[PDB]
Design a protein around this motif. Structure first.
Motif, PDB file in Angstrom:
ATOM      1  N   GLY A   1      39.230  19.583  45.000  1.00 49.64           N
ATOM      2  CA  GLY A   1      39.692  20.839  45.614  1.00 49.64           C
ATOM      3  C   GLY A   1      41.166  21.026  45.340  1.00 49.64           C
ATOM      4  O   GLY A   1      41.578  22.171  45.070  1.00 49.64           O
TER       5      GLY A   1
ATOM      6  N   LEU B   1      43.437  29.443  52.634  1.00 49.79           N
ATOM      7  CA  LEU B   1      42.427  28.910  51.733  1.00 49.79           C
ATOM      8  C   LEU B   1      42.175  27.442  52.036  1.00 49.79           C
ATOM      9  O   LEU B   1      43.111  26.672  52.261  1.00 49.79           O
ATOM     10  CB  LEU B   1      42.853  29.072  50.274  1.00 49.79           C
ATOM     11  CG  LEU B   1      42.738  30.476  49.687  1.00 49.79           C
ATOM     12  CD1 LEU B   1      43.069  30.469  48.207  1.00 49.79           C
ATOM     13  CD2 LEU B   1      41.347  31.033  49.920  1.00 49.79           C
ATOM     14  N   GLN B   2      40.901  27.063  52.045  1.00 51.20           N
ATOM     15  CA  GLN B   2      40.470  25.683  52.241  1.00 51.20           C
ATOM     16  C   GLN B   2      39.542  25.258  51.113  1.00 51.20           C
ATOM     17  O   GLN B   2      38.436  24.762  51.336  1.00 51.20           O
ATOM     18  CB  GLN B   2      39.789  25.495  53.589  1.00 51.20           C
ATOM     19  CG  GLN B   2      40.702  25.706  54.771  1.00 51.20           C
ATOM     20  CD  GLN B   2      40.055  25.290  56.067  1.00 51.20           C
ATOM     21  OE1 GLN B   2      38.986  24.681  56.070  1.00 51.20           O
ATOM     22  NE2 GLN B   2      40.697  25.614  57.182  1.00 51.20           N
ATOM     23  N   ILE B   3      39.981  25.501  49.875  1.00 52.68           N
ATOM     24  CA  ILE B   3      39.211  25.114  48.701  1.00 52.68           C
ATOM     25  C   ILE B   3      38.833  23.648  48.803  1.00 52.68           C
ATOM     26  O   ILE B   3      39.667  22.802  49.141  1.00 52.68           O
ATOM     27  CB  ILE B   3      40.020  25.403  47.426  1.00 52.68           C
ATOM     28  CG1 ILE B   3      40.624  26.807  47.501  1.00 52.68           C
ATOM     29  CG2 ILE B   3      39.140  25.262  46.201  1.00 52.68           C
ATOM     30  CD1 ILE B   3      41.453  27.187  46.305  1.00 52.68           C
ATOM     31  N   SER B   4      37.570  23.343  48.520  1.00 53.58           N
ATOM     32  CA  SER B   4      37.023  22.008  48.710  1.00 53.58           C
ATOM     33  C   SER B   4      36.502  21.457  47.390  1.00 53.58           C
ATOM     34  O   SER B   4      36.384  22.169  46.391  1.00 53.58           O
ATOM     35  CB  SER B   4      35.902  22.015  49.758  1.00 53.58           C
ATOM     36  OG  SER B   4      34.809  22.808  49.337  1.00 53.58           O
TER      37      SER B   4
ATOM     38  N   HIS C   1      33.147  25.484  47.559  1.00 55.62           N
ATOM     39  CA  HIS C   1      33.035  25.946  48.941  1.00 55.62           C
ATOM     40  C   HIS C   1      34.450  26.257  49.422  1.00 55.62           C
ATOM     41  O   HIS C   1      35.212  25.339  49.738  1.00 55.62           O
ATOM     42  CB  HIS C   1      32.360  24.897  49.812  1.00 55.62           C
ATOM     43  CG  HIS C   1      32.377  25.219  51.273  1.00 55.62           C
ATOM     44  ND1 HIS C   1      32.274  24.251  52.249  1.00 55.62           N
ATOM     45  CD2 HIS C   1      32.481  26.401  51.927  1.00 55.62           C
ATOM     46  CE1 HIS C   1      32.318  24.823  53.439  1.00 55.62           C
ATOM     47  NE2 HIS C   1      32.443  26.126  53.271  1.00 55.62           N
TER      48      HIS C   1
ATOM     49  N   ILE D   1      36.777  28.141  52.192  1.00 58.21           N
ATOM     50  CA  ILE D   1      36.858  28.729  53.524  1.00 58.21           C
ATOM     51  C   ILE D   1      38.126  29.564  53.607  1.00 58.21           C
ATOM     52  O   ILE D   1      39.215  29.093  53.257  1.00 58.21           O
ATOM     53  CB  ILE D   1      36.836  27.649  54.618  1.00 58.21           C
ATOM     54  CG1 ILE D   1      35.411  27.145  54.848  1.00 58.21           C
ATOM     55  CG2 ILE D   1      37.404  28.189  55.917  1.00 58.21           C
ATOM     56  CD1 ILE D   1      34.470  28.205  55.374  1.00 58.21           C
TER      57      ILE D   1
ATOM     58  N   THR E   1      43.059  21.422  53.546  1.00 57.64           N
ATOM     59  CA  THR E   1      43.234  22.718  52.855  1.00 57.64           C
ATOM     60  C   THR E   1      42.988  22.539  51.369  1.00 57.64           C
ATOM     61  O   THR E   1      42.642  23.541  50.706  1.00 57.64           O
ATOM     62  CB  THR E   1      44.637  23.244  53.140  1.00 57.64           C
ATOM     63  OG1 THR E   1      44.679  24.492  52.457  1.00 57.64           O
ATOM     64  CG2 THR E   1      45.719  22.305  52.637  1.00 57.64           C
ATOM     65  N   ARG E   2      43.157  21.319  50.854  1.00 59.30           N
ATOM     66  CA  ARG E   2      42.960  21.024  49.442  1.00 59.30           C
ATOM     67  C   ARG E   2      41.651  20.275  49.239  1.00 59.30           C
ATOM     68  O   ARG E   2      41.460  19.564  48.252  1.00 59.30           O
ATOM     69  CB  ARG E   2      44.136  20.231  48.881  1.00 59.30           C
ATOM     70  CG  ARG E   2      45.379  21.073  48.643  1.00 59.30           C
ATOM     71  CD  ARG E   2      46.561  20.220  48.234  1.00 59.30           C
ATOM     72  NE  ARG E   2      46.879  19.224  49.248  1.00 59.30           N
ATOM     73  CZ  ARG E   2      47.641  19.452  50.307  1.00 59.30           C
ATOM     74  NH1 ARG E   2      48.178  20.638  50.528  1.00 59.30           N
ATOM     75  NH2 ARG E   2      47.869  18.464  51.167  1.00 59.30           N
ATOM     76  N   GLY E   3      40.727  20.434  50.182  1.00 57.66           N
ATOM     77  CA  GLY E   3      39.417  19.829  50.072  1.00 57.66           C
ATOM     78  C   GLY E   3      39.320  18.402  50.564  1.00 57.66           C
ATOM     79  O   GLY E   3      38.943  17.505  49.807  1.00 57.66           O
TER      80      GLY E   3
END
Lengths: 310, 135, 210, 210, 132, 128
Positions: free
Chosen positions: C47, C95-98, C150, C152, D185-187
RNA sequence: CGCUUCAGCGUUCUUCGGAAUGUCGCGCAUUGGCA
């Protein structure tokens, strides 16, 4: 950042190596059919174990150690062609300069199993031409190459005469078009600048070295057979085995005589068994030209014409 | 890993022993001309290493400790290639016979374990490294 | 307060090399491995790697102040969407890119075709004078592999959601053209983003127009 | 006075990093470890982290009063649930969230695969003016790991138990749609809650509906 | 150490500083360690050490597990390999005696002696970075 | 112990050395030393301080002596990485005092060194 | 009829902030005082 589509037009067969070489024992060479069946070892070994022919294969390898072609062995015990296709990966065209082949250099294929010219190999060539950090230049890997466009070629060294050698490599056949995607920034590199530098690099390559091979008798036979294409000019020797002028920016920059002397010094420093024994600088350095075909046309390895499209 | 003839242990230390036993100066023209395994050059060693490396990475990507039938057939073809290379060049034959490599790959097939195959690849890698060091 | 979930797929057009250290390499073997999920031992896209490439691309797109030393010095839209740590101006990351794990569909597709998950590529660097080359082997994710992400999105300000999602789509368009992980100058890391569904999982916000 | 015990599991969907200081490591080795139980040396999820994340998300969802400065100023439901210390209005905490320990089933599952519970993620920061990488190594709990939590609810007012458990459900839903620990926040730290048993350990309250 | 010298962090400092040479070129100093050993090779050796150190640190018993012992045997092979490829690396190994230390740690077969060697390597790389 | 030009090392000298280096620009200490590097060095000395604190014997054990040696190594590494850390270490003579503590080999001298380090951190915070 | 060299290199290895805060700091009963 501007984007462009690089069209690599293959005027001379291109072999991007994979680091893997096979010998005439590993694969099949139908000389009469003039086709090379590339096979994978595990399937052949398990097929011979099922058929009970593996002991015969080992004995055949032991009998003639230096020359142990698989085709002759399979002809010895009369194995059906469909039985070959059971373990044979795929067949390839044969262009033999010499008889039987010796060493085969395999093309590069990704995990999906398709032929492709890597972006890094194009980037290296464009860096050699363009130098004098290239982060701004980006080359995408090529679109996959159709297997119909791949064939085996034999490399012929020309030290004023054609000389068959145990060089056979899988190369993209001439007339093939290869597609790349190139992205550059307006500030650092300009598409016109790189195209002009490619043209000047090819012109230097022709003037400094190519005429020194044209004057040779073997070079004359190479030209008469059609080795020098009429069109070839944004020429870039992308493939492996194109030659010492290629893969080296310095020869074009140095005066023909100064460049020849420096190249002779480097070659003597590295390869003492050939150029080290030579007392004086030859008329042309390197000595030999760096490929024939079943057709009338002759070819020099790795010649390409680029064509950038926005 | 395994054991060679006379019950001698096969380890990286034994790899150094093997490479140094066949290591002789044999100076020529007043210049040292290092000879390993009677004329065995580095290129042949590296070709054999790469032959190992293929199935090495194939097993490394695998998760199960048991060698799949693909690995078994790859090792069979590895034996075939080692025999062919030994027949082609006397130096490669000397290297193979001194290093007991084919015995080692047969033992690897017998064990059918990832650990034994790794140890064999490490022993092959050691041999290459030692040869590079002593040259 | 709304949480919106975006789920889609990342498909690698070309081989992708996102590296991970801590692995010893046998001579002649993979010197630089790819980052893999320890559980399944499958390739993964981190992420952090997606967020950093996207934020960097978006920052270059909007513009950079001269002598921009810090990430906390960024455009206000970047500071609001990706967060901040400036002393006295600590914003929050919407943003909570995973981590994008290896898809099961693509895994079964690879198992059908007897394809290894990661290809091994042979490279080398040749000196432009001595014509002496030093070789290397790089590990890359086989082309046609699929990773499902995913992301958020937190609705800290309701009025700004349209602008923030415009910026998100701009970053996605930038990252799809740009590479990810290993250098794209060499052609590694080409990727494609296909969104499946956008929906506000928590709260009463309307994400249908998104 | 009743005590209802909630027991379940926290499943690590994405690698979880809860920072715990006090560790010196070799040059180039792991830089930021995770919180671990000293007795077992296995990763832990502190009850402080769970309670803080749940309370923060619930307070955001119910709403923050304009210019709020302290936690005692949160909504009355939040103060009733998680506690308060306001002068003259000290409200006891009905929720007593406990440290989540590494599940024994997950430990045996990882020992089955010969897999380490913690992975060393390799990351870097690319400067915006020099574009020079700065490398970091962050310990994370491997995905596929489970932590079995333990929560105690004190039934002080019989009337508000249904509303309190509705708020607990909302907070757990928010936390599932959110992350736990650092770097989320960065997965990082994506988790799932699997509730096993809600029962009234102390007293005669009826917890069948909850 | 040979000559009765004792391996130590101060020993690492003296080894780095005595091999240090200014080698001024065009009026500009070019510090060279162990006959031109670059810091990238040291960082590669330190990465090997990092992997073995993580493996042993995550362990519990003071006595090294066979997995750690195997890594130490591999480390000696890697040291031999790198000695052969680059002469500067060979000079560094022969001066530091790091390869000899790997044999010594194996004989000790304990985690404390490994940790000491890890700290010795850290001192080597730290002083090389400082004196640069 | 003592510094060059015969000055005395104490908490008074900690205040004095934090003040002389202090340069107005923002308040710059030791040519760009930040609070974070100081807190990292304080973390190192805090680990060693906890080790010694837990102990009761006045004589420094072998493990804490090795910890002090590794502290010197970390001082050298941070000096190499950052010029400001090198300037701070040479102006405050922290590594020299580590050598002095090793020479004395007692809990009192190490605790005094910890107090001096803590005073350096405190006055650095105060003068910013 | 293949052969040889090269197998990775150079370079970052964490950084920047927060380092506790707010509340209570004895109360009562007896002694005292006042009635």
């Amino acid at each position: 950042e501007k984007v462009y589509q690089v069209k690599l037009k293959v005027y001379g067969p291109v072999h991007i190596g994979s680091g893997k070489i096979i010998r005439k024992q590993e694969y099949i060479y139908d000389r009469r059919k003039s086709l090379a069946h590339i096979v994978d070892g595990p399937n052949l070994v398990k097929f011979l174990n099922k058929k009970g022919k593996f002991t015969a294969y080992l004995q055949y390898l032991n009998t003639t150690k230096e020359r142990a072609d698989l085709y002759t062995f399979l002809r010895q015990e009369q194995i059906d062609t469909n039985d070959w296709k059971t373990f044979v990966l795929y067949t390839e065209r044969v262009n033999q300069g010499k008889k039987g082949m010796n060493d085969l250099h395999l093309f590069v294929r990704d995990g999906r199993g398709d032929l492709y010219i890597p972006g890094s190999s194009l980037k290296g060539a464009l860096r050699t031409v363009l130098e004098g950090a290239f982060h701004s230049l980006s080359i995408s890997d090529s679109l996959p190459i159709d297997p119909k466009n791949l064939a085996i070629y034999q490399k012929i060294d020309i030290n004023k005469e054609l000389k068959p050698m145990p060089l056979y490599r899988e190369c993209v056949n001439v007339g093939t078009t290869v597609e790349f995607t190139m992205k550059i920034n307006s500030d650092d590199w300009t598409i016109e600048k790189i195209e002009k530098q490619i043209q000047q690099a090819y012109l230097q390559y022709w003037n400094k070295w190519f005429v020194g091979m044209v004057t040779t008798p073997g070079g004359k036979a190479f030209i008469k057979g059609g080795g020098l294409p009429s069109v070839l000019p944004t020429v870039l020797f992308l493939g492996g085995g194109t030659g010492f002028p290629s893969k080296t920016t310095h020869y074009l920059q140095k005066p023909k005589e100064q460049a020849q002397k420096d190249i002779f010094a480097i070659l003597q420093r590295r390869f003492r068994n050939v150029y080290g024994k030579m007392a004086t600088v030859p008329k042309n350095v390197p000595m030999v030209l760096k490929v024939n075909d079943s057709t009338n046309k002759w070819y020099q390895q790795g010649v390409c014409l680029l064509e950038f499209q926005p | 890993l395994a054991k060679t003839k006379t019950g001698e242990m096969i380890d990286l230390n034994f790899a150094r022993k093997v490479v140094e036993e066949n290591k002789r100066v044999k100076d020529n023209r007043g210049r040292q001309e290092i000879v390993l395994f009677n004329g065995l050059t580095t290129s042949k060693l590296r070709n054999l290493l790469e032959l190992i490396n293929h199935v090495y990475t194939k097993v490394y990507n695998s998760d199960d400790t048991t060698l799949s039938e693909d690995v078994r057939d790859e090792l069979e073809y590895l034996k075939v290639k080692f025999a062919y290379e030994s027949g082609r060049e006397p130096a490669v034959r000397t290297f193979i016979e001194k290093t007991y490599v084919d015995k080692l790959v047969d033992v690897v097939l017998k064990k059918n374990t990832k650990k034994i195959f790794l140890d064999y690849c490490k022993y092959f890698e050691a041999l290459v490294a030692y040869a590079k060091f002593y040259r | 307060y709304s949480k919106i979930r975006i789920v889609g797929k990342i498909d690698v057009l070309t081989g992708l090399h996102i590296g991970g250290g801590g692995e010893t390499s046998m001579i002649g073997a993979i010197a630089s491995p790819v980052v893999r999920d320890p559980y399944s031992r499958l390739p993964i896209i981190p992420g952090s790697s997606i967020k950093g490439k996207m934020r960097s691309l978006l920052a270059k797109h909007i513009g950079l102040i001269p002598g921009q030393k810090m990430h906390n010095q960024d455009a206000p839209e970047i500071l609001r969407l990706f967060g901040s740590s400036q002393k006295g101006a600590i914003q929050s990351s919407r943003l909570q890119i995973s981590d994008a794990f290896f898809s099961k569909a693509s895994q079964e597709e690879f198992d059908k075709k007897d394809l290894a998950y990661t290809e091994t590529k042979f490279e080398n660097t040749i000196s432009r004078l001595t014509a002496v080359a030093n070789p290397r082997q790089i590990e890359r994710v086989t082309r046609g592999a699929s990773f499902d992400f995913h992301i958020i999105y937190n609705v800290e300000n309701i009025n700004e959601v349209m602008a923030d999602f415009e910026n998100i789509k701009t970053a996605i368009h930038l990252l799809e053209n740009d590479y990810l992980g290993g250098g794209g100058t060499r052609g590694n890391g080409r990727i494609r983003f296909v969104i499946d569904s956008i929906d506000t999982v928590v709260g009463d916000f309307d994400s249908s127009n998104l």
